Amino acid sequence: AKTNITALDELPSFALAIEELYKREAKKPHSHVQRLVSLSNTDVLGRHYRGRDLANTRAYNVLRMDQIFARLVSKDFSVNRDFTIYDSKYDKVPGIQFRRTAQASHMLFLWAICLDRFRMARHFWLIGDQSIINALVASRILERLSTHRALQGPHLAEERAKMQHNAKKFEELAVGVLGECHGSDSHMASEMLHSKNDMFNKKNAINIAYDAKSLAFLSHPATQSVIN
Amino acid sequence: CHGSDSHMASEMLHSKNDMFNKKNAINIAYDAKSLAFLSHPATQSVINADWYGHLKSVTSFWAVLFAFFFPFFVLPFINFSGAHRLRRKFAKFYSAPYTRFISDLLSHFVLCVVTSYFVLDKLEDTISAIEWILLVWFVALLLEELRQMIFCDGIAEYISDTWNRLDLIMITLFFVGFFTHASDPSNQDSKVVSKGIHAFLVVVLWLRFMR
Amino acid sequence: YYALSKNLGPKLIMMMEMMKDVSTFVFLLLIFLIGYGVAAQSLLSPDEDFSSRTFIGVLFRPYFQIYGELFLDDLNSEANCLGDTPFTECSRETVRMVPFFLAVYILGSNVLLVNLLIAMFNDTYMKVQEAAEDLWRKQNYELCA
Amino acid sequence: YYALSKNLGPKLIMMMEMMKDVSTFVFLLLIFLIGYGVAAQSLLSPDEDFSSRTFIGVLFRPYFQIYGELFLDDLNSEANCLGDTPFTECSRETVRMVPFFLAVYILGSNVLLVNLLIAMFNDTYMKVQEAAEDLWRKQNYELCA
Amino acid sequence: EYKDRPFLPAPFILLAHVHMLFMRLLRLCGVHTQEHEKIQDDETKRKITTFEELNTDKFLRRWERERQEMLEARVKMTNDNVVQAMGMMDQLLEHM
Amino acid sequence: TTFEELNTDKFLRRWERERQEMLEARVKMTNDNVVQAMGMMDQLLEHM
Ligand SMILES: CC(C)CCC[C@@H](C)[C@H]1CC[C@H]2[C@@H]3CC=C4C[C@@H](O)CC[C@]4(C)[C@H]3CC[C@]12C
Ligand SMILES: CC(C)CCC[C@@H](C)[C@H]1CC[C@H]2[C@@H]3CC=C4C[C@@H](O)CC[C@]4(C)[C@H]3CC[C@]12C
Ligand SMILES: CC(C)CCC[C@@H](C)[C@H]1CC[C@H]2[C@@H]3CC=C4C[C@@H](O)CC[C@]4(C)[C@H]3CC[C@]12C
Ligand SMILES: CC(C)CCC[C@@H](C)[C@H]1CC[C@H]2[C@@H]3CC=C4C[C@@H](O)CC[C@]4(C)[C@H]3CC[C@]12C
Ligand SMILES: CC(C)CCC[C@@H](C)[C@H]1CC[C@H]2[C@@H]3CC=C4C[C@@H](O)CC[C@]4(C)[C@H]3CC[C@]12C
Ligand SMILES: [Mg+2]
Ligand SMILES: [Mg+2]
C-alpha cells in the first residue's frame, strides 16, 4: 500500500521482495530476526528515536535493517543507497548494469548474512563488488550477532556456533583474496589497502579490519608490508 | 538431542525413570562412572542450570555476593526467573545451590580467620567468649557431618571423599586442643600444649578452604 | 618501546599471558603461606597479645622462605633453644615442631608449587606463542597508527 | 676442542643459540632491577648526596637477590630498625616498604622471569636441536680442513 | 551436595538442624501433616520418549552417513564396485 | 575495483582447483564416476 513518507515510497520492487523474505522468515516460531528488530529500539526508518500501524506492517523494510546492521558493524558504517538509478532514463550509461547488480547483490548479501545462510551469502558476495571489505563486514556482523543479547536462548545455540564458523570462513575469504592481490601485483594491493572507502566515513581497509578485530587479516604479510 | 532442541534435552535429562527408584539420567550416569557423558556440554548446561536455580546465568560471583550482603538493596533491581513478589524472590534466590555454596565459603573463611586469631592471641585463665563461639561452631560442623553421613549413599562413599576426611581431622584436632585447655584453664603448660594441637588445626582448616 | 622489536615484543605479550599462571600460583600458595604462618608464629611466640607485629610475623618469614632464604638461625634464636644441635634443649617442647612445619611447608611450596608453575608456564608458552605473534602484528598497526 | 665429541659439540652450538634467550631475559630483567634498585636505594638511604656508592647500591643487592641470596639481615641493619620483628620500630616509616618492594621484585624476577626463561629454553631446544646437529656436521669439516 | 544442604551458615546451621529434627519428630511421632510432590504426566513422558527415539534414529543415520564419507570406507566401496565391474565385463565379453 | 574483482575470481578458481586436487574429493569423484560406470554397464548388458 501507498505511504505518505517519500523515502519509503521511492523504494523499488526488489527491496519490497527482500522485505517479504524478512517478513516470512520473521513469522516462523522462535525466529531471532523478529526479536532482533524488536530489541533494536528504532523507528520505521531505522533512526534511534523510539504511527503504530506503519511500525508493525512495515517493520522489516531494508532501510531499517541497514540501520540495524550499521549499528552492528561500528560507529561509522553508512551505506549510501541510490535507488534513482533503476529508472529507465539511465539506460544509456555504460556501467549502470554492474552498479544496479552490485547494490542489489549487497542488499541480498546482508539479508543472507542475517539469516546465516553461508552458501547463498558467498554467492551474493561473488556477484557484487568490494569483496575484501564485504567479507570483513560479514565476519564482523556474524561475530557481533553471535554475542548479541537477541541471540541468547536454548534454541539458538547451534545457530550461534554456525555464526562463529561462518565468521571464520569469511575472514579466510578476505585473507585469500588479499593474498591473491599481493601475489599478482604488490603495489596495486598496497594501493587497494590504502584506498579510502565512502561506506566507512572515508578511511582505509586495514582500519576497517582492525575495527572488525580480524587478527588473520592483520597478521597477513601483505597487510604487514603496508604497515611497515 | 541437544542439537535438535536443548529444552527437550534438558527435560529428558531431568526426567525421573521408574527403573532406578525415581531419579534422573545424570545421576544414573554418575553412578555408572561415565566421565564422557558427564563431561558433555549438554549435561554440563543442565548442571549449571541446576547450580543457578531460578536465576539468570549471566550473574557473576561479585553480583551474587553483593546481593547476599545487601538483600534489600540489590535483589529488586535485578532480572531473574508486595509480599507476593519480595517473598517469591527471596525464596528463589536463597533456595539456589550457588547461594548456599557462597554462604558456606564465607562461613568457612570467617571460621579460618576467627580460629587463626584465636590461636595467635594469648589464652586467658578461663574459657574465653571466642572459645565458646568456636565450640558452638564445631559442634554444629560435627552435626552437619553426621547429617551428611546419614543421608548419603553409604559410609564408603562419604569416607572416599578427601574433604570429609579433612572435616573429621579438623573436628578431632579442635576437640582435643579444647579439652586439653579446658582440663586445667589456669595451667600455662596446658595452654602451650593446646596451642600446639591448634597449630595443626589451623593448617588443616586453610587446607580445607581449597574445596 | 620494546614492542617494535621482533624478540622483546611477543615475549612481553607472553609475560602478560603468564601473569594468570602467576596469579593461580599466588592463590594456591596463599593457602599454605597463611596456614603455616599462623601455626609457626603461634608456636614461636606463645602467651602473647595479638598486635601488628604478630601479623608481620605471619607474613614476613613464610613468604621469603620459598625463595631459599631459610631463617633457621633467626628461627633458632627466637625459639630460645640453647643446644649445640639447633632445635634441641628448648624451654617449651612445642616450639621444636617449627622445623617439621617448615619442612612440610617448603616441600609444599618449592618442591610442588614452583615445579607445578614451571609445568604451567611450559604448557602455556606452547599454547599461546603463535597467538602472541599475531597479537604483536596487530599491536604493530596500533603503534604505527 | 669439545666440538669433536658427539655429546659436547651440539650442546655448545645449543649454548650459543640459548644466549639470545639469556639476552632477552637480561633486557626484561633490567627494567625491574633498575626500577626496584633506584626505589629501594632511595628508601634505605634518604637525604644523601648522589655519589658512586649510590650507583653501586642500586646495582649490587637487586642483581644478587634473584639468585636467592636475600640481604634481609643486611637490609634490616641499614634500615636502622631496632625491633625483634625485623622491619618494625624504625626511625622513618617509609623504610618499612623495603620488604614489600623486595616481595614484588623477586615475585617479578624469580617466579615470573626465571620460569619464563625455562619455558623459552625448552621451546628453543626442541626447535633447534636438529639444526645444531647439522651445524655440528658442517663444523666437523671446518675443524678437519 | 549443595542442593540437599541447608541454606544457613555454620554458626547458625544448628537452627536448621533442630528444625529438621523437629520435622522428623513430627513425621515419626506426631503425623499431623505429610509430604507433597509433583508427578510428570503421561503426555509429556510419551513426548520425551518420542523425542529420544527420533533423535536416536537421527544420530544413527548421521553416524552411518559419516562413516560412509570416511576415506577408508570410500576406497573400500570403490574397490568392491571395481570388482563388480569386472564381473560385468566378463558377462559382456562372454556375450560378444 | 577491476583489479580486486579480477583477483577475487582468480582466488576462487584457484581455491576450487585446490579443493578438487585434495585426496578426499578425488576419492569421492572417482567413487561417483565408478557408480556412473555401472549405470553404463547396465545399459550395455541390456542392449546385449
Ligand atoms: C594427623 C595430624 C594432623 C595430627 C598430629 C597430632 C598432633 C596434634 C599431636 C600428636 C603428638 C602431639 C605431641 C606429643 C607430645 C608433646 C610434648 C609436650 O610436652 C608438648 C606437646 C607435644 C609436642 C604434642 C603436641 C601435639 C602433637 C604433635
Ligand atoms: C601427617 C603428618 C602430620 C605427620 C605427623 C608427624 C608429627 C605429628 C610428628 C613428627 C615430628 C614430631 C616431633 C618430634 C620431636 C618432638 C620432641 C619431643 O620431646 C616432643 C614431641 C615432638 C615435638 C614431636 C611431636 C610430633 C611430631 C611433630
Ligand atoms: C626425603 C625427605 C622428605 C625426608 C624427610 C625429612 C624429615 C622426616 C625431617 C627433616 C627435618 C627434620 C626435623 C629437623 C629438626 C627437628 C627438631 C627436633 O628437636 C625434633 C625433630 C625435628 C622436628 C625433625 C623432624 C623430622 C624432619 C622434619
Ligand atoms: C599494587 C600495589 C602497589 C599494592 C599497594 C600496596 C602498598 C601501597 C602498601 C602495602 C604494604 C603497605 C605498608 C605496610 C605498613 C606500613 C607501616 C605504617 O606505619 C605506614 C605505612 C606502611 C609503610 C604501608 C604503606 C603502604 C604499603 C606499602
Ligand atoms: C601468596 C603470596 C604472594 C602472599 C603475599 C605476601 C605479601 C602480602 C607480604 C609478604 C611479606 C610482607 C611484608 C613483610 C614485612 C613488612 C614490614 C612491616 O613493617 C610492614 C609490612 C611489610 C612491608 C609486609 C607487607 C606484606 C608482605 C609484602
Ligand atoms: Mg565480485
Ligand atoms: Mg563435609
JSON list of C-alpha atoms in Angstrom, two decimals, chain C residues 2 7-8 11-12 14-15 18-19 22 25-26 29 52-54 56-57 60-61 63-64 66-69 71 74 78 114 117-118 121-122 125-126 129, chain D residues 21 24 27-28 31-32 68-70 72-73 84-89 96 99 102-104 106-107 110-113 115-116 118-120 122-123 126-127:
[
{"chain": "C", "resi": 2, "resn": "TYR", "atom": "CA", "xyz": [60.34, -2.94, 23.39]},
{"chain": "C", "resi": 7, "resn": "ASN", "atom": "CA", "xyz": [62.23, -10.57, 20.03]},
{"chain": "C", "resi": 8, "resn": "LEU", "atom": "CA", "xyz": [61.11, -8.45, 23.01]},
{"chain": "C", "resi": 11, "resn": "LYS", "atom": "CA", "xyz": [57.80, -12.04, 24.99]},
{"chain": "C", "resi": 12, "resn": "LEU", "atom": "CA", "xyz": [56.04, -9.07, 26.63]},
{"chain": "C", "resi": 14, "resn": "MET", "atom": "CA", "xyz": [53.73, -13.76, 26.62]},
{"chain": "C", "resi": 15, "resn": "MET", "atom": "CA", "xyz": [54.57, -12.16, 30.06]},
{"chain": "C", "resi": 18, "resn": "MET", "atom": "CA", "xyz": [51.87, -15.89, 32.10]},
{"chain": "C", "resi": 19, "resn": "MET", "atom": "CA", "xyz": [50.57, -13.36, 34.75]},
{"chain": "C", "resi": 22, "resn": "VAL", "atom": "CA", "xyz": [51.46, -16.42, 38.41]},
{"chain": "C", "resi": 25, "resn": "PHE", "atom": "CA", "xyz": [50.28, -19.89, 41.89]},
{"chain": "C", "resi": 26, "resn": "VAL", "atom": "CA", "xyz": [49.68, -16.97, 44.33]},
{"chain": "C", "resi": 29, "resn": "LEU", "atom": "CA", "xyz": [50.46, -20.55, 47.65]},
{"chain": "C", "resi": 52, "resn": "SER", "atom": "CA", "xyz": [50.54, -5.68, 64.28]},
{"chain": "C", "resi": 53, "resn": "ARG", "atom": "CA", "xyz": [53.90, -7.48, 64.91]},
{"chain": "C", "resi": 54, "resn": "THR", "atom": "CA", "xyz": [52.01, -10.82, 65.07]},
{"chain": "C", "resi": 56, "resn": "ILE", "atom": "CA", "xyz": [54.03, -9.11, 60.23]},
{"chain": "C", "resi": 57, "resn": "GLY", "atom": "CA", "xyz": [55.45, -12.32, 61.78]},
{"chain": "C", "resi": 60, "resn": "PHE", "atom": "CA", "xyz": [57.34, -11.97, 56.65]},
{"chain": "C", "resi": 61, "resn": "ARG", "atom": "CA", "xyz": [59.30, -15.23, 57.05]},
{"chain": "C", "resi": 63, "resn": "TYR", "atom": "CA", "xyz": [56.87, -15.64, 52.00]},
{"chain": "C", "resi": 64, "resn": "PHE", "atom": "CA", "xyz": [60.66, -15.22, 51.86]},
{"chain": "C", "resi": 66, "resn": "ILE", "atom": "CA", "xyz": [60.05, -20.09, 49.37]},
{"chain": "C", "resi": 67, "resn": "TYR", "atom": "CA", "xyz": [62.94, -18.26, 47.65]},
{"chain": "C", "resi": 68, "resn": "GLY", "atom": "CA", "xyz": [65.51, -20.33, 49.50]},
{"chain": "C", "resi": 69, "resn": "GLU", "atom": "CA", "xyz": [66.30, -17.89, 52.28]},
{"chain": "C", "resi": 71, "resn": "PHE", "atom": "CA", "xyz": [65.66, -18.08, 58.56]},
{"chain": "C", "resi": 74, "resn": "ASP", "atom": "CA", "xyz": [66.91, -16.47, 63.31]},
{"chain": "C", "resi": 78, "resn": "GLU", "atom": "CA", "xyz": [63.58, -16.81, 68.56]},
{"chain": "C", "resi": 114, "resn": "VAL", "atom": "CA", "xyz": [57.20, -23.95, 41.97]},
{"chain": "C", "resi": 117, "resn": "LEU", "atom": "CA", "xyz": [54.26, -23.39, 37.95]},
{"chain": "C", "resi": 118, "resn": "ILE", "atom": "CA", "xyz": [57.18, -24.42, 35.62]},
{"chain": "C", "resi": 121, "resn": "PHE", "atom": "CA", "xyz": [54.47, -21.96, 32.09]},
{"chain": "C", "resi": 122, "resn": "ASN", "atom": "CA", "xyz": [55.82, -24.52, 29.56]},
{"chain": "C", "resi": 125, "resn": "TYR", "atom": "CA", "xyz": [54.06, -20.95, 26.26]},
{"chain": "C", "resi": 126, "resn": "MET", "atom": "CA", "xyz": [53.48, -23.78, 23.70]},
{"chain": "C", "resi": 129, "resn": "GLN", "atom": "CA", "xyz": [53.22, -18.48, 21.13]},
{"chain": "D", "resi": 21, "resn": "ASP", "atom": "CA", "xyz": [67.14, -16.08, 25.24]},
{"chain": "D", "resi": 24, "resn": "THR", "atom": "CA", "xyz": [66.11, -11.36, 26.19]},
{"chain": "D", "resi": 27, "resn": "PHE", "atom": "CA", "xyz": [66.62, -6.91, 28.80]},
{"chain": "D", "resi": 28, "resn": "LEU", "atom": "CA", "xyz": [63.35, -7.82, 30.58]},
{"chain": "D", "resi": 31, "resn": "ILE", "atom": "CA", "xyz": [63.56, -2.95, 33.83]},
{"chain": "D", "resi": 32, "resn": "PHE", "atom": "CA", "xyz": [62.65, -4.43, 37.25]},
{"chain": "D", "resi": 68, "resn": "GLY", "atom": "CA", "xyz": [68.20, -16.50, 46.26]},
{"chain": "D", "resi": 69, "resn": "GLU", "atom": "CA", "xyz": [70.70, -14.58, 48.37]},
{"chain": "D", "resi": 70, "resn": "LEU", "atom": "CA", "xyz": [68.40, -12.31, 50.31]},
{"chain": "D", "resi": 72, "resn": "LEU", "atom": "CA", "xyz": [67.40, -9.09, 54.68]},
{"chain": "D", "resi": 73, "resn": "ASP", "atom": "CA", "xyz": [69.71, -9.10, 57.74]},
{"chain": "D", "resi": 84, "resn": "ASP", "atom": "CA", "xyz": [62.84, -8.02, 67.44]},
{"chain": "D", "resi": 85, "resn": "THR", "atom": "CA", "xyz": [60.46, -8.27, 64.48]},
{"chain": "D", "resi": 86, "resn": "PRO", "atom": "CA", "xyz": [62.78, -7.02, 61.62]},
{"chain": "D", "resi": 87, "resn": "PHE", "atom": "CA", "xyz": [61.18, -4.08, 59.68]},
{"chain": "D", "resi": 88, "resn": "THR", "atom": "CA", "xyz": [59.40, -2.67, 62.78]},
{"chain": "D", "resi": 89, "resn": "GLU", "atom": "CA", "xyz": [60.33, 0.13, 65.24]},
{"chain": "D", "resi": 96, "resn": "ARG", "atom": "CA", "xyz": [59.31, -0.25, 56.15]},
{"chain": "D", "resi": 99, "resn": "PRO", "atom": "CA", "xyz": [60.38, -5.79, 52.12]},
{"chain": "D", "resi": 102, "resn": "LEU", "atom": "CA", "xyz": [61.50, -6.62, 47.52]},
{"chain": "D", "resi": 103, "resn": "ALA", "atom": "CA", "xyz": [58.48, -9.04, 47.72]},
{"chain": "D", "resi": 104, "resn": "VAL", "atom": "CA", "xyz": [57.08, -7.63, 44.43]},
{"chain": "D", "resi": 106, "resn": "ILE", "atom": "CA", "xyz": [61.56, -11.24, 43.50]},
{"chain": "D", "resi": 107, "resn": "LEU", "atom": "CA", "xyz": [57.96, -12.22, 42.54]},
{"chain": "D", "resi": 110, "resn": "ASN", "atom": "CA", "xyz": [62.20, -15.39, 40.19]},
{"chain": "D", "resi": 111, "resn": "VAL", "atom": "CA", "xyz": [58.59, -16.56, 39.99]},
{"chain": "D", "resi": 112, "resn": "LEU", "atom": "CA", "xyz": [57.89, -15.00, 36.59]},
{"chain": "D", "resi": 113, "resn": "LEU", "atom": "CA", "xyz": [61.10, -14.24, 34.61]},
{"chain": "D", "resi": 115, "resn": "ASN", "atom": "CA", "xyz": [60.32, -19.69, 34.89]},
{"chain": "D", "resi": 116, "resn": "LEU", "atom": "CA", "xyz": [59.61, -17.80, 31.62]},
{"chain": "D", "resi": 118, "resn": "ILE", "atom": "CA", "xyz": [62.90, -22.08, 31.44]},
{"chain": "D", "resi": 119, "resn": "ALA", "atom": "CA", "xyz": [59.90, -22.15, 29.01]},
{"chain": "D", "resi": 120, "resn": "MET", "atom": "CA", "xyz": [61.89, -20.23, 26.31]},
{"chain": "D", "resi": 122, "resn": "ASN", "atom": "CA", "xyz": [62.68, -25.75, 26.43]},
{"chain": "D", "resi": 123, "resn": "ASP", "atom": "CA", "xyz": [60.94, -24.39, 23.31]},
{"chain": "D", "resi": 126, "resn": "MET", "atom": "CA", "xyz": [63.09, -28.51, 20.73]},
{"chain": "D", "resi": 127, "resn": "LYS", "atom": "CA", "xyz": [63.22, -26.05, 17.79]}
]
